[PDB]
Design a protein around this nucleic acid. Structure first.
Ligand SMILES: [Mg+2]
Ligand SMILES: [Mg+2]
Ligand SMILES: [Mg+2]
Ligand SMILES: [Mg+2]
Ligand SMILES: [Mg+2]
Ligand SMILES: [Mg+2]
Ligand SMILES: [Mg+2]
Ligand SMILES: [Mg+2]
Ligand SMILES: [Mg+2]
Ligand SMILES: [Mg+2]
Ligand SMILES: [Mg+2]
Ligand SMILES: [Mg+2]
Ligand SMILES: [Mg+2]
Ligand SMILES: [Mg+2]
Ligand SMILES: [Mg+2]
Ligand SMILES: [Mg+2]
Ligand SMILES: [Mg+2]
Ligand SMILES: [Mg+2]
Ligand SMILES: [Mg+2]
Ligand SMILES: [Mg+2]
Ligand SMILES: [Mg+2]
Ligand SMILES: [Mg+2]
Ligand SMILES: [Mg+2]
Ligand SMILES: [Mg+2]
Ligand SMILES: [Mg+2]
Ligand SMILES: [Mg+2]
Ligand SMILES: [Mg+2]
Ligand SMILES: [Mg+2]
Ligand SMILES: [Mg+2]
Ligand SMILES: [Mg+2]
Ligand SMILES: [Mg+2]
Ligand SMILES: [Mg+2]
Ligand SMILES: [Mg+2]
Ligand SMILES: [Mg+2]
Ligand SMILES: [Mg+2]
Ligand SMILES: [Mg+2]
Ligand SMILES: [Mg+2]
Ligand SMILES: [Mg+2]
Ligand SMILES: [Mg+2]
Ligand SMILES: [Mg+2]
Ligand SMILES: [Mg+2]
Ligand SMILES: [Mg+2]
Ligand SMILES: [Mg+2]
Ligand SMILES: [Mg+2]
Ligand SMILES: [Mg+2]
Lengths: 386, 109
RNA sequence: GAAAUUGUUGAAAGGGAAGGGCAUUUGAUCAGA
RNA sequence: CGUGGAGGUCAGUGACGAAGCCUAGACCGUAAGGUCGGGUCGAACGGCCUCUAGUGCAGAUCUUGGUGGUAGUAGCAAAUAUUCAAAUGAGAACUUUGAAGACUGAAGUGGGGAAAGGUUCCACGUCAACAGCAGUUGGACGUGGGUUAGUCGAUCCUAAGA
RNA sequence: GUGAACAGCCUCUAGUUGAUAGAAUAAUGUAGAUAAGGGAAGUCGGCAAAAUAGAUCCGUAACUUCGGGAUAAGGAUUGGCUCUAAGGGUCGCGAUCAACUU
RNA sequence: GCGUUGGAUUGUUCACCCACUAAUAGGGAACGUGAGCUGGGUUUAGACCGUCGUGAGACAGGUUAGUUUUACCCUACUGAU
RNA sequence: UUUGCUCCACACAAUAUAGAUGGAUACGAAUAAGGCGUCCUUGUGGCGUCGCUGAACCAUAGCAGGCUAGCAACGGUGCACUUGGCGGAAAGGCCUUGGGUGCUUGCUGGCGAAUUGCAAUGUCAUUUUGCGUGGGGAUAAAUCAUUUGUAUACGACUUAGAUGUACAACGGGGUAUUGUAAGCAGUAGAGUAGCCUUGGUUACGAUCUGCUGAGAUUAAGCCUUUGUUGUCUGAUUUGU
């Protein structure tokens, strides 16, 4: 008989299976549609989630109860040092989909990216790309032949880039290598851009700008095996329930005489690939710019790094992307920031945000001070120093 | 790594015992001290002086000190079997406080 | 010193049972003349 | 067709190997079955004519015994709690000694008894089985030792009752 | 020792340190806890839990078989320290001795 | 395609009313769903009442109390090698 | 690697065969329309012709195809070289230059075949593997163990580790939590008890005050580090 009281199902069947992602770096499964009139540019970027903080800004939203008023907003900081271009892949269209025709690599690959090709780097003889780099012996005839093939074919061009983890506080030391689609016309010009940028760095400001809507693609934080109550949000069973209450009472009707795929079951929670869209960039800050965390309203000469450092991450010393709100993945995780797949004109996008103040109080507690100078000014002289 | 040598260390038993069950804290301290001596001397055969066991258990099963100053001496042994011809002996140092002390080579005994 | 059941060795087959019937291929094995 | 036993017969087979058993080896019979070879084995047994029956199994939640898959699985999680060193030993988380940390907390995890048990007491030797891990230890195993009354009990008295 | 207490908690004498262990710290459990705001809307039903709780002082209704109801209900106080006062024995007002309770 | 509720009374399905709501549609799945729960009801044994029966006892009448066992196998499902 | 691996050529051994036995012989579109040829005024053009199936086209004779002698013509075809071009949908094929070599049944001769006994597939293809002989080529990793916690029930994941912006253990600094440590001192302290230079002293005293936002703790899943000390070649396995 019927359910006797209607209620929406628990969870989204489109995010199935709730299994562990096959990689710690979530795949970009779609790049922006290519507009072959614009200049050649990366469609995405690689960064590392540093942490969260809060900003204050005046809201520019006519008709709102908070128009021209100050609002406090959570922001996520993504450490984004320049990525190194080390390769270029050509993709030909086939009746079976896109197929990589060939890949041309840079002549010199740094140990950062060479470590990606090894499970035991320290005891290896580090032979990776040693025979390939000889293809640049005298004139690079083989390299130019492969690039000519990419131009003659390969309706889609993607560059191979890798992060510079040595510039992050992470202990990993093994770089993240990814394909980023080159948008901007003239497949020939895409290949020329890739070849010229071989062994060269691309900074995050050449890809993203202030107020832009971007998408964050990352593997969520892992939580291991989870019961249905927190994995799917099902109702806790009553206290009187024998055999436990963090369960789904009826996992199926008599017929079909099978548990169905749509029934909440205990299993892995977290560590899933997610692609969350429409996160507005609030800052495109630069590592070389001391007073990274300053605004035109604050002027306090401070970097984005909170007092004591980003908890479990470290200090931001590179270029960084501050997006509004939160993004999937935990701190220290590699994230991919990609340009929006559509042209959003909604007055939520297209809003020009100007930060008034960025919180740099310690996130290791109820941080009361923005700067060590401010802590000294409030507390006066202490016994050890100050 | 294959010679006789004595050094004084400080072990952060606080961070090694963080969150440990109360009935297992002192036994866990014993095992962490064995692991500590194994890490620092390379010896699987680690022996603890009964005075060191007293120092560990001084405040019962849960009241292990945050820091202990240990004298670890890697020495050689010759017995029925080779069985790791080197072994470590761990003794307490009996200092007033075990704070602000660096690893030092004893150089005398 | 049987069978159930089991180890080893050897032979063979094995996409959600296995086993069976008719027929032949292939491998192994063998009587009759 | 086959089985146990019986009368007759083949002056049947057999320690130079009877019977039994094993044998994707051979032959006969539509079949019940029969025959042969090879291995194993060790003391009896068979063909035919008849006699006779406690004479043929897939079952009966059959009977007795044996054995699986389950499965190296469920589990060995109440009674706060163990640790260091030495000795012994082939072997030590578990034995002994020392050290330390704990508990029972005198309505005891202490010291005795009644019922019951019956040697479990104690020593020496000792670990195949038992102590649902272990074991060099034990209420185990083997061998011994040990219970001393005029006064403590029984014994005597009567009780309900017999 | 605390305390009204053979309660609970800690200790002395005595005894024991015996419960298979080691390593991790997923879900679901068993046992023990906590929780913003709401406060039984949950549920057959306040089941479970929470709240109350000792002692001193105040105050205590209906009803009643006049005995109770009654710890009704409902209030207040409680540590530590330094003091003050009162409460006894024996000997010949004095001398001396002594323990707690308020 | 999408949603179709919070409550008072009743074990209740049903019913009824309060109220919110865009709406408070109807149904199935062994009258879905007890090795998922719960056990208020029904539905053993205790007990009370009314009627009936000479009686033992009866009542699709009322009332009160009344043990809800097992997954470690196979598949299915969820995750994992 | 107790001579390992790979490629090519040859030979020899195996191994099988979803099934060779002359050739899978390439426009596109329409079908109430087309193909081909040709012409021009180049089109949705005129004229001619074809279909009515591949019943075609090509190939096809020679001891399973031998050995030879000529003629004719500079064709056809095989091979290994070679010139250049095109082909990415799974290209791995298509076309083209030049010379060399063999065959040529286009035509005409000479020799051979037997006895496989009147048939017996009467063995002629290609699939993988191994080995040996030569030539050519290259000179790693992965796993276990240790380690990290962005992971995690176990597996799995993600990190690090052979001399360095290396890693670790400590120590230092930052951050953070609590809330002012111990010790010493005080002409602080309700008072009580003594003492005598009766205007002060001694003893006890919760507490108060100062040194003292001090002291303690702080990564165990915080940040950082010109410091101290140490570590850095164990095991197993993998070949086209
Ligand atoms: Mg419905
Ligand atoms: Mg949520
Ligand atoms: Mg229950
Ligand atoms: Mg924080
Ligand atoms: Mg914890
Ligand atoms: Mg026998
Ligand atoms: Mg058998
Ligand atoms: Mg008989
Ligand atoms: Mg015989
Ligand atoms: Mg057989
Ligand atoms: Mg005999
Ligand atoms: Mg019978
Ligand atoms: Mg039978
Ligand atoms: Mg039958
Ligand atoms: Mg049976
Ligand atoms: Mg049986
Ligand atoms: Mg188990
Ligand atoms: Mg249990
Ligand atoms: Mg226990
Ligand atoms: Mg002992
Ligand atoms: Mg107790
Ligand atoms: Mg106690
Ligand atoms: Mg004894
Ligand atoms: Mg045992
Ligand atoms: Mg044993
Ligand atoms: Mg012995
Ligand atoms: Mg005995
Ligand atoms: Mg007497
Ligand atoms: Mg008292
Ligand atoms: Mg609450
Ligand atoms: Mg509250
Ligand atoms: Mg209230
Ligand atoms: Mg209610
Ligand atoms: Mg309700
Ligand atoms: Mg109700
Ligand atoms: Mg209750
Ligand atoms: Mg009261
Ligand atoms: Mg009352
Ligand atoms: Mg039903
Ligand atoms: Mg069911
Ligand atoms: Mg049930
Ligand atoms: Mg039911
Ligand atoms: Mg009931
Ligand atoms: Mg009844
Ligand atoms: Mg009557």
């Amino acid at each position: 008989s019927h359910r006797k009281y209607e209620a929406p199902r628990h969870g989204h069947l489109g995010f199935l299976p709730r299994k562990r992602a096959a990689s710690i770096r979530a795949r970009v499964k779609a790049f922006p549609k290519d507009d072959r009139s614009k200049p050649v540019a990366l469609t995405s970027f690689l960064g590392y989630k540093a942490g969260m903080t809060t900003i204050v800004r005046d809201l520019d939203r006519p008709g709102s109860k908070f128009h021209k008023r100050e609002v406090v907003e959570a922001v996520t900081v993504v450490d984004t040092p320049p990525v190194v271009v080390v390769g270029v892949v050509g993709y030909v269209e086939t009746p079976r989909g896109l197929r990589s025709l060939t890949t041309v690599w840079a002549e010199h690959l740094s140990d950062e990216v060479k470590r990606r090709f090894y499970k035991n780097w320290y005891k290896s003889k580090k032979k990776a790309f040693t025979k390939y780099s000889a293809k640049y012996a005298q004139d690079g005839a083989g390299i130019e032949r492969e690039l000519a093939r990419i131009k003659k074919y390969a309706s889609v061009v993607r560059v191979l880039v890798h992060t510079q983890i040595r510039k992050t506080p992470l202990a990993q030391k093994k770089a993240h290598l990814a394909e980023i689609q080159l948008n901007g016309g003239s497949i020939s010009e895409k290949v020329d851009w890739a070849r010229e940028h071989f062994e060269k760095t691309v900074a995050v400001d050449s890809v993203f700008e202030q107020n832009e809507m971007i998408d964050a693609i990352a593997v969520t934080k892992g939580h291991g095996f989870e019961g249905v109550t927190h994995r799917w949000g099902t109702k806790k069973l009553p206290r009187k329930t024998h055999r436990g209450l963090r369960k789904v009472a009826c996992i199926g009707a008599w017929h079909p005489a099978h548990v169905m795929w749509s029934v909440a079951r205990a299993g892995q929670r977290g560590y899933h690939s997610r692609t969350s869209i429409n996160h507005k960039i609030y800052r495109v800050g630069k590592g070389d710019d001391e007073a990274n965390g300053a605004t035109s309203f604050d002027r306090t000469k401070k970097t984005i790094t909170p007092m004591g450092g980003f908890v479990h991450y470290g200090e931001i010393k590179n270029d960084f992307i501050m997006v509004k709100g939160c993004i999937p993945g935990n701190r220290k995780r590699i994230v991919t920031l990609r340009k929006s797949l559509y042209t959003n004109t909604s007055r939520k996008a297209l809003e020009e945000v100007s930060l008034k103040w960025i919180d740099t109080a310690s996130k290791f507690g109820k941080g009361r001070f923005q700067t060590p100078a401010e802590k000294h000014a409030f507390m006066g002289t202490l016994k050890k120093d100050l | 790594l294959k010679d006789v040598v004595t050094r004084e260390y400080t072990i952060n038993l606080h961070k090694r015992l963080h969150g440990v069950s109360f009935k297992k804290r002192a036994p866990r301290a014993v095992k962490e001290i064995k692991k500590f001596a194994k890490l620092h001397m390379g010896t699987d055969d680690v022996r603890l002086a009964p005075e060191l066991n007293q120092a560990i258990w001084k405040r019962g099963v849960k009241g292990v000190e945050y820091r202990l100053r240990l004298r670890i001496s890697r020495k050689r042994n010759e017995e029925e079997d080779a069985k790791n011809p080197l072994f470590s002996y761990v003794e307490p140092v009996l200092v007033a406080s075990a704070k602000g002390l660096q690893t030092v080579v004893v150089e005398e005994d």
